[PDB]
Ligand binder design. Structure first.
Ligand SMILES: [Zn+2]
Lengths: 38, 207, 145, 176, 59
RNA sequence: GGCACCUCGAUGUCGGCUCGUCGCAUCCUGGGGCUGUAGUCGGUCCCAAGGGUUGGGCUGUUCGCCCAUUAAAGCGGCACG
RNA sequence: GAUAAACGCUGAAAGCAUCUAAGUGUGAAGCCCACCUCAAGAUGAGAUUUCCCAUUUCUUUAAGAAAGUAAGACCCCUGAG
């Protein structure tokens, strides 16, 4: 995980998804991309 | 479950079968009549009243001799209860000899501590004195009472007040002998109480 | 001095009512109840005589909490010792000790003196579905309030 | 809802009733009972079914999808049932079963077991494959998860448990 | 007196506003003190007034 | 550091002693995600305040340097308690 | 037993993917039980077993006043576990 205030997709495959009162970023290709806004 | 009261005689030693001295105290006992059976449908729980010693007759009153005589005994001195015991299995006026603790080997004695009167704030908490020389004048006192901001004294600041006289239990002690012909148990270790006090022994709680 | 009706002690007659709590938010049920208890709705109101009624609350488990407050309205207490702040409960008391709920959410909305205490022991709250007080023939209230 | 507007083509041997919200589905093996939202207009016509519903769902489009997907799940489950196949690498790993026990030897000191509820069984071909079969999709999935949860793979040599078609990246870490 | 008019009146389906409003509309001008006294004692008369007021703002 | 509202019919400073207590922006133990993580070690970030957190040499000392241990030798508030 | 970070299962709005809105789980020295003690002045003053059962005038018959007792308790004396 990378937990940052600002969150951006870094690959082309990355997607922006809300799961709870939070904002994920999931990328099946690489794992270094899981970003969760906090 | 397995519960017995009794006196407290003292302490001596005993060799085991392998040449090893063992400190041992002498919990004495006598037979003792179950006095009343408290049930769910009547008293909200399940328990058993017992009593370990014999009064004279001058030293009781009609309530006591009317509350005992439903089991036909001389009026007793102590009366206690027990819980978590498999009730069943019992009757009004039975007995509980020392048999129940053959080599139970795990047991939790309780009792009442000694008594030590008004005591300082060092014999009760292990608080340390202040420098007894180098010109000081703070030998044997209880320290400060806290900070300034709150304009009061917090709860649970500890200082002088009667020491000892409240019950306490020890856990996981063994048993060494059961001399049914004289009703005496022998356990390992130190047990609390003054001589001739009242003691109770039940099976372990921590399995 | 002139003529205005001032209720005496015993001339006031109290009644008995039974109120349900099936799917009602905590606040409003408590509000109606608290208004009934203090003696209002009786034109014989007097602000130092205890002209109240007797309330009996049923089904205190099925009371409704809107939105969250199922897991957020955190009650509290303090034991007057250092670090004693025990926030133990939540909106879980609906399950257990459901009497505690209304017996605070109303023992708040009353005054804070003796009158406001002897005016509280007329409460009887039951999480269950039937009361033992048929000895006194209580009636029913409705709620479009 | 393009997912809440497909067909429910019942197979052979299918009984479907309605008692309250409870729409049970029975057939050759299935006797399942689920719940369904109170805004669902079921259909008719032996084996040709759809789901008309009074729309304006949560956001005009939500409940439809889950509801029709779940009913199609019911149907497919009662008809045949499902599978989840597992492999095993990590030289020295085996698995043996006698009914509702699955011992596992995957390198720990002591062999790990696994119980089983009723609606599921295990069909062990050899020491390197397992196959779960059952009725529900959820339960099959959960048990397969719990089983993989004992030792998921490792991206260096390839040990651990995998699904069959599951992919695992390999970080070619040097040897010292 | 206001709280007492509240209690009594509300029983007749007249909120403690609409009663006063209708009364000051049908041109009836009783003083609150007398209204409180009536509400406590002469229930028949109070109900008569409440009826007239109900009629009044009904127009 | 700034201002000068507060106390001049008197509101006593630093360290050390006895005694604690609270916050977490966490030092150890506990649960986790990523790695330029083969293993043993590690780096960073996240959840977490339950308990624990050493003896001595030198200066009035806070501060600090050093010796010897340890799971670790935390940072701060409470009239710089 | 219920949860935190994290990990899922099943599933759509978005014919796919996707832990979530409906459904359904795992998960920490931390939360609540488990262990030890105090505790009905808990004026919402709890429960159980046993014991003791009736004079005089009238204030006026009322939750009246007064006197002698039962069960028991205390005073006084020998002491200390
Ligand atoms: Zn990416």
């Amino acid at each position: 995980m990378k937990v940052r205030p600002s969150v951006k997709p870094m690959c082309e495959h990355c997607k922006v998804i809300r799961r709870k009162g939070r904002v994920m970023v999931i990328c099946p290709a690489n794992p270094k991309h899981k970003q969760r806004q906090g | 479950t397995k519960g017995i009261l009794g006196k407290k005689v003292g302490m001596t030693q005993i060799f085991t079968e392998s040449g090893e001295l063992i400190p041992v105290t002498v919990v004495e006992a006598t037979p003792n009549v179950v006095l009343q059976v408290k049930t769910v449908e009547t008293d909200g729980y399940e328990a058993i009243q017992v009593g370990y010693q014999d009064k004279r007759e001058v030293l009781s009153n009609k309530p006591a001799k009317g509350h005992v005589a439903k089991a036909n005994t001389a009026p007793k001195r102590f009366i206690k209860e027990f819980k978590n015991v498999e009730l069943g299995e019992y009757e009004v006026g039975k007995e509980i000899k020392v048999d129940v603790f053959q080599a139970g080997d795990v047991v939790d004695v309780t009792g009442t501590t000694k008594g030590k009167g008004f005591q300082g704030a060092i014999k009760r908490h292990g608080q340390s004195r202040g420098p007894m020389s180098h010109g000081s004048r703070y030998h044997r006192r209880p320290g400060s009472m806290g900070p300034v901001a709150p304009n009061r004294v917090f709860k649970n600041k500890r200082l002088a007040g009667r020491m000892g006289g409240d019950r306490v239990t020890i856990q996981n002690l063994e048993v060494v002998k059961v001399d049914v012909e004289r009703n005496v148990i022998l356990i390992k270790g130190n047990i609390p109480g003054a001589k001739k006090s009242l003691i109770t022994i039940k099976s372990a709680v921590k399995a | 001095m002139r003529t205005t009706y001032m209720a005496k002690a015993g001339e006031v007659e109290r009644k008995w009512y039974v109120v349900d709590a099936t799917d009602v938010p905590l606040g409003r049920l408590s509000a109606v109840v608290a208004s009934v208890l203090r003696g209002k709705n009786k034109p014989t109101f007097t602000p130092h005589v205890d002209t109240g009624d007797f309330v009996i609350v049923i089904n205190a488990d099925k009371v409704k909490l809107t939105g969250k407050k199922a897991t957020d309205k955190i009650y509290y207490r303090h034991s007057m010792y250092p670090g004693g702040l025990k926030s133990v409960t939540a909106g879980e008391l609906r399950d257990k000790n459901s009497r505690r709920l209304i017996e605070t959410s109303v023992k708040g909305m009353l005054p804070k003196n003796t009158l406001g205490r002897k005016q509280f022991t007329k409460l009887n709250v039951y999480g269950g579905a039937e009361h033992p007080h048929a000895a006194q023939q209580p009636e029913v209230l409705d709620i479009t309030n | 809802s393009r997912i809440g507007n497909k067909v429910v083509v019942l197979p052979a041997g299918v009984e479907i009733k309605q008692d309250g919200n409870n729409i049970t589905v029975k057939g050759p093996k299935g006797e399942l009972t689920r719940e369904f939202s109170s805004d669902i207009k079921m259909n008719i016509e032996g084996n040709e079914v759809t789901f008309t519903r009074p729309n304006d769902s949560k956001e005009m489009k939500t409940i439809h999808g889950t509801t029709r997907a779940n009913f199609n799940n019911m149907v497919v489950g009662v008809s045949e049932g499902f599978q989840k196949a597992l492999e095993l690498i990590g030289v020295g790993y085996r698995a043996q079963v006698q009914g509702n026990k699955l011992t596992l030897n995957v390198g720990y000191s002591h062999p790990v077991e696994m119980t089983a509820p009723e609606g599921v069984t295990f069909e062990v071909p050899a020491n390197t494959q397992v196959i779960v079969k059952g009725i529900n999709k959820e339960v099959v999935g959960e048990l397969a998860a719990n089983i993989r949860g004992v030792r998921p793979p490792e991206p260096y040599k390839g040990k651990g448990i995998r699904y069959v078609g599951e992919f695992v990246r390999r970080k070619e870490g040097k040897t010292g | 007196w206001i709280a007492r008019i509240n209690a009594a009146a509300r029983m007749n389906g007249l909120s403690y506003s609409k009663l006063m409003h209708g009364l000051k509309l049908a041109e009836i001008d009783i003083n609150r003190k007398m209204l409180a006294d009536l509400a406590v004692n002469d229930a028949a008369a109070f109900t008569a007034l409440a009826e007239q007021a109900k009629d009044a703002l009904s127009k």
